[PDB]
Amino acid sequence: WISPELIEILLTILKAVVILLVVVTCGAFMSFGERRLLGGSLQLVADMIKMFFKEDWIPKFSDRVIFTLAPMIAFTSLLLAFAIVPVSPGWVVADLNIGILFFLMMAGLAVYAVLFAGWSSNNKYSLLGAMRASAQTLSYEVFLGLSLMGVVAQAGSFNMTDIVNSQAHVWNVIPQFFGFITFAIAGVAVCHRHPFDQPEAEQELADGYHIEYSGMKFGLFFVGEYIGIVTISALMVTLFFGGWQGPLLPPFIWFALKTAFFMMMFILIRASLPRPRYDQVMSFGWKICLPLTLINLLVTAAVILWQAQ
């Protein structure tokens, strides 16, 4: 039962399992780091044990399937969106032809977490807060793809390995700078993170949709959000900062350093930058970021076609 093809198959399977486990544990450690900065592994073990052994109480007047289904979406959507990220040569889960399209599919499915949580939580204020949160994330998902499309236009493909190999000389943060800032804004807004933290806080008619979620469902929401930051940072690295490419260090060391830097940058962005109003946020999205992405794609295409002799 020994064959090198099978050895390659189980080796790639082990690589994918290791990537998955590192992503979940790294999101949990991000939860610890945000809780501490604003042993520790033993504290997270204690917290996880408490979520295990606390009773899980679904409300009597709530739909059980939707209520249970929303935390699975909030976890699995971006945790499966990580699967296209190449962390090292020979260390990618899937070398998809669609790639960044698969990230867009996972974000489009990810909006159902907030929608389903707000509907199943039988409360009018929670429902209105969920409508506000879903309107916000749709208002920023409307330009997430085009801010990505500048980079896709430069690389000429949707494959992440091809994007990284196209960043071999110059990293994409220099030409696709406006794509970079719009992608950072939209990736923060998709994960419902600061300054897009609580759209329900602008009105006493609205409450959080994480309310009435207790135990492992609340833990799933928390760890899914932190995993979302992890994969948004990793996609930002692979799309705009050369991925694993660096001068002297091993490639995974460079990728991990850039991902950790962007994770801590999102931490200080939460800690420092204040919260705008709801109408200000939606107006900023629809009126600034989408035209900026469209003009960025047009200018990128003109530059590409000009420099083709």
Ligand X SMILES: CCCCCCCCCCCCCCCCCCCC
Residue of 91, 112, 284, 286 that binds ligand X (CB under 6 A)? 91
Q: What is the DSSP string of 173-200?
A: TTTTHHHHHHHHHHHHHHTT-TTSS-GG
Minimal distance in Å, beta carbon 72 to ligand 3PE? 7
Count the residues of the shown chain that bind ligand X, applying the rule CB under 6 A: 14
Contact partner, 40, from ligand X, ligand 3PE, other proteins, none, Cβ < 5-8 Å per class: none
Q: How far is the CB of 196 from other proteins (least distance, A)?
A: 14
For residue 244, give the DSSP letter: T
Rounded CA-CA distance 35/98 in Å is: 36
Q: Which residues lie below 8 Å from residue 72, measured CB to CB, with a gap of 6+?
A: 220
Q: Which stretch binds ligand X (CB under 6 A): 172-180, 206-214, 246-254, 280-288?
A: 246-254
Q: What's the first-to-final CA gap in the chain, in angstroms?
A: 55
Give the helix ranges, DSSP H, for 38-123: 40-53, 64-81, 100-120
| Residues at the interface with ligand 3PE (CB under 6 A) | 73, 76-77, 80, 95-97, 102, 109, 112
> Taking a C-beta distance cutoff of 8 angstroms, is the pair 74, 110 a contact?
yes
**Which of other proteins, ligand 3PE, ligand X, none binds 77 (CB below 5-8 Å, type-dependent)?**
ligand 3PE
Region near ligand X per CB under 6 A, out of 45-53, 60-68, 83-91, 278-286: 83-91
Residue 26 interacts, among ligand X, ligand 3PE, other proteins, none and using kind-specific CB cut-offs from 5 to 8 Å, with ligand X
How far apart CA 115 and CA 192 sit, in angstroms, is 13
Q: Can you tell me the distance from the alpha carbon of 172 to that of 258, in angstroms, rounded to the nearest whole number?
A: 14
Select the binding partner of residue 236 from ligand X, ligand 3PE, other proteins, none (C-beta < 5 to 8 A, by kind). none
Residues 6+ apart with CB under 8 A from 186: 140, 141, 143, 144, 147, 289
Residue closer to other proteins, measured from CB, 99 or 251: 99
CA distances from 21 to 16, 79, 160, 305 (A): 9, 11, 21, 43
The nearest distance, CB 163 to ligand X, in angstroms, is 18
183 Cβ contact partners less than 8 Å away, ≥ 6 residues apart: 144, 147, 148, 236, 239, 240
We find the least distance from the C-beta atom of residue 87 to ligand X, in angstroms, to be 4
* CA–CA gap between residue 209 and residue 305 (Å, rounded): 47
Footprint (CB under 6 A) of ligand X, residues 8-67: 18-19, 22-23, 26
Q: Which of residues 151-210 bind ligand X (CB under 6 A)?
A: none
Q: Which residue is nearest to ligand X (CB)?
A: 252
- The least CB distance from residue 42 to ligand X, in Å, is 21
Nearer to ligand 3PE, 56 or 95 (CB): 95
Regarding 259 and contact with ligand X (CB under 6 A), the answer is yes
Indicate the residue among 80 and 164 with the shorter CB distance to other proteins.
Answer: 80
Q: What is the H or E stretch that residue 262 is in? A: helix 251-272
Closest CB 225 distance from ligand 3PE, rounded Å:
15
Q: Return the number of other C-beta atoms located less than 10 Å from residue 144's C-beta.
A: 24
State the minimum distance, in angstroms, from the CB of residue 231 to ligand 3PE.
14
Question: Least separation, in Å, of the C-beta of 23 and ligand X?
Answer: 5
Summarize as ranges the residues that interact with ligand X (CB under 6 A): 18-19, 22-23, 26, 87-88, 91, 230, 250, 252-253, 256, 259
